[PDB]
Amino acid sequence: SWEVGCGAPVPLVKCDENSPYRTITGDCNNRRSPALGAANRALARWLPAEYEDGLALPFGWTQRKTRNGFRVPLAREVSNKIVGYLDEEGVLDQNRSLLFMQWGQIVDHDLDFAPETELGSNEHSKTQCEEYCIQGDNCFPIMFPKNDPKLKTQGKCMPFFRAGFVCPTPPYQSLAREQINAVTSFLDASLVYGSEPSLASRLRNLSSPLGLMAVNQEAWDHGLAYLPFNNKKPSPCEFINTTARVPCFLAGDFRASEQILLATAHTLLLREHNRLARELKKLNPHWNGEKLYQEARKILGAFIQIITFRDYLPIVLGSEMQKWIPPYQGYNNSVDPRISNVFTFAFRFGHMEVPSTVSRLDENYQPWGPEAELPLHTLFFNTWRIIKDGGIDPLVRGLLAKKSKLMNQDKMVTSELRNKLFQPTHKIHGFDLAAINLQRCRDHGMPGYNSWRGFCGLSQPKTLKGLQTVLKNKILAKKLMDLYKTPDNIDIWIGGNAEPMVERGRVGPLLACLLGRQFQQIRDGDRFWWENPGVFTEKQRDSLQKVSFSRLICDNTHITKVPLHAFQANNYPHDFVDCSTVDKLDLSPWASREN
Ligand code: HEM
Ligand SMILES: *[C@@H]1O[C@H](CO)[C@@H](O)[C@H](O)[C@H]1NC(C)=O
Ligand SMILES: *[C@@H]1O[C@H](CO)[C@@H](O)[C@H](O)[C@H]1NC(C)=O
Ligand SMILES: *[C@@H]1O[C@H](CO)[C@@H](O)[C@H](O)[C@H]1NC(C)=O
Ligand SMILES: [Ca+2]
Numbered sequence: 001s002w003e004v005g006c007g008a009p010v011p012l013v014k015c016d017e018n019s020p021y022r023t024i025t026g027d028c029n030n031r032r033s034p035a036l037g038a039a040n041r042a043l044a045r046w047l048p049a050e051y052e053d054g055l056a057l058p059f060g061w062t063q064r065k066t067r068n069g070f071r072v073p074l075a076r077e078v079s080n081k082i083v084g085y086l087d088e089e090g091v092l093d094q095n096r097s098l099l100f101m102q103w104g105q106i107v108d109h110d111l112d113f114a115p116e117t118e119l120g121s122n123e124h125s126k127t128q129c130e131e132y133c134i135q136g137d138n139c140f141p142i143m144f145p146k147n148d149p150k151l152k153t154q155g156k157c158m159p160f161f162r163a164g165f166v167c168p169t170p171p172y173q174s175l176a177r178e179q180i181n182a183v184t185s186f187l188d189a190s191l192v193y194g195s196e197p198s199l200a201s202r203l204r205n206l207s208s209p210l211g212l213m214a215v216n217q218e219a220w221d222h223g224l225a226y227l228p229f230n231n232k233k234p235s236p237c238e239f240i241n242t243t244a245r246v247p248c249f250l251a252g253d254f255r256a257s258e259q260i261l262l263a264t265a266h267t268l269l270l271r272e273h274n275r276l277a278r279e280l281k282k283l284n285p286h287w288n289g290e291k292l293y294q295e296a297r298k299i300l301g302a303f304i305q306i307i308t309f310r311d312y313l314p315i316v317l318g319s320e321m322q323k324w325i326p327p328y329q330g331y332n333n334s335v336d337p338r339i340s341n342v343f344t345f346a347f348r349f350g351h352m353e354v355p356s357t358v359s360r361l362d363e364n365y366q367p368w369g370p371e372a373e374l375p376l377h378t379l380f381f382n383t384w385r386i387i388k389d390g391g392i393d394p395l396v397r398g399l400l401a402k403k404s405k406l407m408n409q410d411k412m413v414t415s416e417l418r419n420k421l422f423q424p425t426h427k428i429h430g431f432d433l434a435a436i437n438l439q440r441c442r443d444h445g446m447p448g449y450n451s452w453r454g455f456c457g458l459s460q461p462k463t464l465k466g467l468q469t470v471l472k473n474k475i476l477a478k479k480l481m482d483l484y485k486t487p488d489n490i491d492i493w494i495g496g497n498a499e500p501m502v503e504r505g506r507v508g509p510l511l512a513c514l515l516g517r518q519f520q521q522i523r524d525g526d527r528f529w530w531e532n533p534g535v536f537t538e539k540q541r542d543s544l545q546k547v548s549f550s551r552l553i554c555d556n557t558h559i560t561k562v563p564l565h566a567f568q569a570n571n572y573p574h575d576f577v578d579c580s581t582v583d584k585l586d587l588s589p590w591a592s593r594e595n
């Protein structure tokens with residue numbers, strides 16, 4: 001079975017045997033083994049890595065090496081022949097807001113992140129890959145099939161650097177290769193406060209004593225705060241509009257500015273943190289800075305947990321929610337709190353829930369301005385459309401009153417992500433999220449679809465007709481088979497996302513299981529979980545399960561009309577109510593009468 005505890009690139013520094021708030025890094029949540037959950041650890045393996053050479057070469061690296069006796073089809077071919085469509089008409093979800101899609105990506109970003117191998121940006125590494133489409137070491141380029149329009153227009157490939165792997169990063173050569181999770185595995189707002197201690201206090205207002213996060217001093221949203229601007233030049237948010245020179249946002253998470261609505265969701269959360277930390281100096285004026293940061297950090301944490309488990313997961317998982325996430329029976333410190341390698345592919349069902357356009361809505365939820373609807377792809381690394389063109393209230397109104405994309409076996413991923421993705425260093429709106437997600441299953445040595453069906457106790461099809469029956473779809477099945485030649489070779493991402501959806505959910509049985517088990521684990525293995533008796537006082541708890549995303553909007557924007565149930569498809573006048581009609585976070589039980 002072998003390797004016992006390779007624990008290299010980490011400063012070990014041990015634990016603080018009480019510290020009534022979590023570490024920034026996730027360390028010390030588990031007392032038996034303190035690294036469990038922590039960031040800059042290997043993603044857990046639910047099943048063994050599958051590589052060409054059984055060590056680190058991804059399937060389809062060496063042309064004349066099969067997988068179960070067949071070549072693997074090019075990622076981009078799969079993307080083109082299965083994942084593509086033209087007609088955005090009739091593709092939206094009549095019963096899920098755009099908030100449904102946005103929260104997905106919020107929670108996802110809190111849980112897992114496998115950054116690329118740097119290994120030098122003062123090298124051809126970037127050139128030898130993008131420019132010459134040469135496969136080598138960490139350069140794993142997405143080759144185009146023949147008849148591909150990008151042949152005519154871009155080149156022979158689109159760049160792809162393999163994901164960060166533990167012990168070194170300098171090539172390792174003995175046991176199966178394991179990618180890193182650079183955020184804390186715990187639902188702990190790590191995407192707001194950082195997963196490394198350095199960044200964590202950079203994000204903080206140390207200047208004053210009040211316990212705030214650093215807010216923007218260049219620019220404001222009426223009275224209301226923006227995220228601080230991100231140092232690093234080069235900036236991609238600058239690059240897409242050279243004229244506006246509005247750089248990316250600096251959040252706890254580095255993907256914060258990937259698209260306007262996620263930077264938007266980030267901007268609700270900072271505001272809430274500060275809002276919490278004023279109310280506390282209001283009620284507990286003796287409490288110092290640290291105590292106001294951490295005690296606010298603690299509430300926002302529980303807020304993310306409730307919304308997710310109470311509002312989000314029940315409408316992702318549906319019928320299968322109770323089967324996997326039965327009621328809370330308290331902290332089981334034998335539960336693995338870690339994100340699994342497979343879960344970081346399971347959670348990308350989200351990619352099929354992203355619609356082709358984002359609107360900005362006025363106070364009567366009508367086109368704010370003449371350019372109110374925009375193509376998704378203009379909004380990658382787009383920060384200027386926020387500070388120079390209406391703030392967040394009009395984007396939040398969109399989120400509330402526009403709909404998420406329904407996954408459709410025939411219309412999987414909008415060409416806004418499948419042809420027009422911008423990547424932070426490549427200067428063209430010209431990449432393919434879908435082909436990337438497929439190259440990446442291989443990079444991360446993922447087991448085939450059947451292995452994972454196997455894992456969730458579900459049939460393993462070997463035949464076209466066998467596959468028609470599970471996907472409940474003839475032509476989807478024919479194509480998969482024509483490309484993969486066996487269901488054993490189908491990449492977990494696309495495999496999983498081809499299954500019809502479970503009753504009252506937005507994922508299939510295979511995904512429901514993988515996702516179910518993980519949210520089960522991330523709740524049960526968390527020592528700092530909000531419902532874990534002792535973490536919060538019972539009155540604090542009685543206040544907390546009255547919180548609403550509606551409520552989060554009301555206190556952190558100049559928006560006054562909000563739905564009760566912000567994830568269901570909600571129409572203006574009717575399904576919207578006044579903010580006063582909405583339960584608020586009563587922090588009276590936080591009052592410290594130490595005097
Ligand atoms: C642009 C992108 C999005 C929207 C415009 C978007 C949206 C989501 C949602 C809604 C998710 C979950 C419900 C979700 C999950 C994960 N994503 Fe994804 N996403 C966009 C773009 C990307 C890009 C680019 C990546 C990196 C792709 C790569 O493999 O190189 C990406 C990743 C993920 C991801 C894995 C994160 C990780 O562990 O590294 C999800 C769980 N998304 N996105
Ligand atoms: C710290 O808070 C003080 C008081 O509000 C304020 O003047 C200062 O801007 C804050 N610093 C930052 C960068 O948020
Ligand atoms: C860039 O921003 C400027 C204002 O800062 C705006 O007027 C212009 O239209 C923007 N250009 C693009 C391509 O978005
Ligand atoms: C705790 O989890 C471990 C490992 O998953 C399991 O063996 C055990 O039965 C669980 N105990 C309880 C009380 O849930
Ligand atoms: Ca795994």
Ligand SMILES: [Ca+2]
Pocket residue numbers: 110111183184185186187188189190191
């Ligand atoms: Ca986290």
